[PDB]
Amino acid sequence: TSRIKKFSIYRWDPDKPGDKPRMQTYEVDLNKCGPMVLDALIKIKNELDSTLTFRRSCREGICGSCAMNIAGGNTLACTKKIDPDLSKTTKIYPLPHMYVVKDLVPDLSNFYAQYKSIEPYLKKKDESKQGKEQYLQSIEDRQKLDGLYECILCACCSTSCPSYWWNGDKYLGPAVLMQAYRWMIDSRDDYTEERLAQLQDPFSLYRCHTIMNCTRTCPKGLNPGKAIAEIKKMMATYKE
Amino acid sequence: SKAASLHWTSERAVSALLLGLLPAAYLYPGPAVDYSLAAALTLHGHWGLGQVITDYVHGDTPIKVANTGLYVLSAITFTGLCYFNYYDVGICKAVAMLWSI
Amino acid sequence: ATTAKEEMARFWEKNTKSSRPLSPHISIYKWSLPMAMSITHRGTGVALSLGVSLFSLAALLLPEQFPHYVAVVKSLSLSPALIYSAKFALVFPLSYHTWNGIRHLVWDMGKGFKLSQVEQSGVVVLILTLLSSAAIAAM
């Protein structure tokens, strides 16, 4: 027997730019395919159409490469179970409201540059003793980073956020803001007030209106919506 | 320096005030509530539509135009409410008369 | 080699003048109750504001005092079912915005951010909106 599943996938070729974006259907026999959508994507490329193009690297949902929109929601292809209902066609799109390089590959360079702009690295007031001894951090203080440092920077959350759709040029977005929070609450970091002062404008932080698509969509189970609410509380109460 | 967070804080404060004025209008109608509702409704509404503008309107000139028009609407709106409060029955009694239909 | 501000400027100069399409968003994204309630909170807020502005405008321009128009309506002797329906439609957007507003104010205090709490508080806001609107319409 065979269990033929249909995938409708977004196509666009920059070397044939005049061919408008379209959807292409592929039939995949699930009895000869791994259980995840990435498995089906690699099988299609290896057996059915080697022009199909997508980013991927790891396989266990840790690298963040294969983020895309599957069945209407942003997620990692490599950890998204194929839906075995053969009467339903699974639609696959690039991450939403992004510039398409080709097929399922979006341009993430603004996303990365927004991440760079928040200075995601440890800053102490005196760094001249770096390299000499372990900084001390209590178990309790370290525990505050749980739920924040696990982010794989896949951009599923930001590209699910309507405010980031309309104002992604100025709104840093949930992924970057949660990383900003991760450095704010690190007990070893000395630049909390400055990290907060950076957000004192109408857009960087304050385009968030608590829509909460970001938390619903995170494939790592994280909660950037809550992280953003904690910044807002710090913003409203920090002195000078 | 802290203008953005201060505005965010003020918005929440006015939202809470509006909340407190609902029960107040039922228990203590009259001039004090009537004019406080006029002020809190106008300011809560002005800032709210301001958020809508910031989200959706882009471009230097479109933004300036949109915000100028909002100021006009807010000013006319607060003027009518005060005018209605002063020369007419007022917001509290207007709502009670409407609900007597 | 390049600053973040420089990178962003290059990003927009490259893409705005490229042939690259923008990938679809509103037309393909799956809906949820929280996302729909978020849009409806904005919708009711704007509806309430335009209501207040219209009333404020009518007060300045209309010739007669408010009790005159109240009397005219009472003189038509409209069906109590129709008046009850009109009361429900008036109070409903205000009731929704008010209850859902409290829900926002609780979020702003940092509480209720678990997905399960987000779903449950939204359903509570919907029930409280229907109950209070039904009760108020019958007064």
Add this chain to the structure above:
Amino acid sequence: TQYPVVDHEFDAVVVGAGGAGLRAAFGLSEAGFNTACVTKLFPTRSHTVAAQGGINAALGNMEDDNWRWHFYDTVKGSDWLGDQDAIHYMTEQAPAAVIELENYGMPFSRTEEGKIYQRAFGGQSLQFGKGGQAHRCCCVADRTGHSLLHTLYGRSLRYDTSYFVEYFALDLLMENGECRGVIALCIEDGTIHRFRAKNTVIATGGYGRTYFSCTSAHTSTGDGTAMVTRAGLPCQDLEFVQFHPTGIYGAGCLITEGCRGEGGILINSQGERFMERYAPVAKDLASRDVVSRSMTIEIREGRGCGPEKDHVYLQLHHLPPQQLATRLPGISETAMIFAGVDVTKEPIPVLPTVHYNMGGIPTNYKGQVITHVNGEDKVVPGLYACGEAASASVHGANRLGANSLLDLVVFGRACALTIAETCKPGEPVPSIKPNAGEESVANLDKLRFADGTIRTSEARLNMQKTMQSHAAVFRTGSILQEGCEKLSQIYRDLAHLKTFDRGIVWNTDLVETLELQNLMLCALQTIYGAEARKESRGAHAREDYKLRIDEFDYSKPLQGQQKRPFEEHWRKHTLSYVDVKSGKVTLKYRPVIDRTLNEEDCSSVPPAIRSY
């Protein structure tokens, strides 16, 4: 002609943005060098990001430790194929290296004193193997690599390194036996770029994807190893392939050896903790070559689990759930996603899985690439290598768990230091012939329009199944020889390759065919070197040549023994060459370095019987 060429001039160019490449790249910039980092992936997608168990250093946070014990463990672990000058450098530098990372903000788990939490790991001991289990594997729960790579990437943002992201390096620019840069394709726009520099650092990772089942990323394709081979330079020790004991059954995803460090155990279908039998002292914390062979025997002898009795079980549910959530949360999720397993209730199905390449580009302990001519090592001017792509060789015939993340930052830093002690920023850039690199572009143009009868995925699958079936945990001469003949035929049949995408922008059809060429050069040398090595050493196990063959018989007293001549024993590194047009493999040998960097401070460890 047909491709636009763009030329860059840098002081140094680093190929690779993993743990090694990033550490080298911003180490050069921190020393004032105008440095380029060319990477085919956005940096935090590199395989380093998937590392779990942690990184070794004798900090002594959990009990009293000594870096010379870690030295001893690594020498023995390598089965005396490891160069003891480089192991000396690596284990002695380890505390300083981990402190550096934590001072970067790497969010290490913590002890009750606030210091870095360290766990037990396979094959590490106190008191030069005499005093029981060491606890020196520093970790961030079971996501140490993720935090290591994201920390290094954030740090790199503080320096003026020029990053060339999603650029695929094609070859070295060699002139007069010196490296003068690299040529590469920009995947985003189709253009060819030549990076000229006085010094080039190869940091391209391993080649685990030559196999059919592996923990390795899809992107681990040996690209840097193949560039060296095409330059006519030797690779080293490629037949030493590490099988990790616990890749998850089916998917192949890694389940950290930290599971056994924290108290997990391997059991077979009878419920037996069978490592008590294969390694009475070390048990499930024996070296990986031993655990993997032991698991393989259990399966061959009918004690495998599952409907097909083809794997074994990793049991964690006797551990307190709070320890699982605090120490092993990553694999807790992975076990549920990929095997439907709740680790507080049921065991994980696991089996040995290709994981890591001990061999690579031969270097000295400073990171400089060497060749071997007329019986002497010789530096290749201007060429460095570090990370999994290099053979320093710190790992010999078997790497210890958690020594690779250490290797990455120690020798990434060493490459940078060596260049800074050898050259000055702003010295004149070496010249290249105007047509330098044209053969790389011509090869790229042949694959782009290839219209034969064997598509890339078909030949790649053939290569992977051959390696899986002919160069696995146990090996024998006749099966190796058939594998050699198979790979040689597959290599000749690349002349009949078939591709479909005729574009140049983001043509992953093309890029994966380039990667296939690279993988095949690595595979050929791996299996031909394995066929020639008629002994068993570390991860290389011959069922027809079961003994380790040294220059003496170190299981007996040495007095009165006649030393075996160099050609009559096997304690020596394999050097492999490929004639790229024919596929002919040539093998030569070079001695292992037994001297340390300071005999008085750290004595050389003579070969001995290796038991766990």
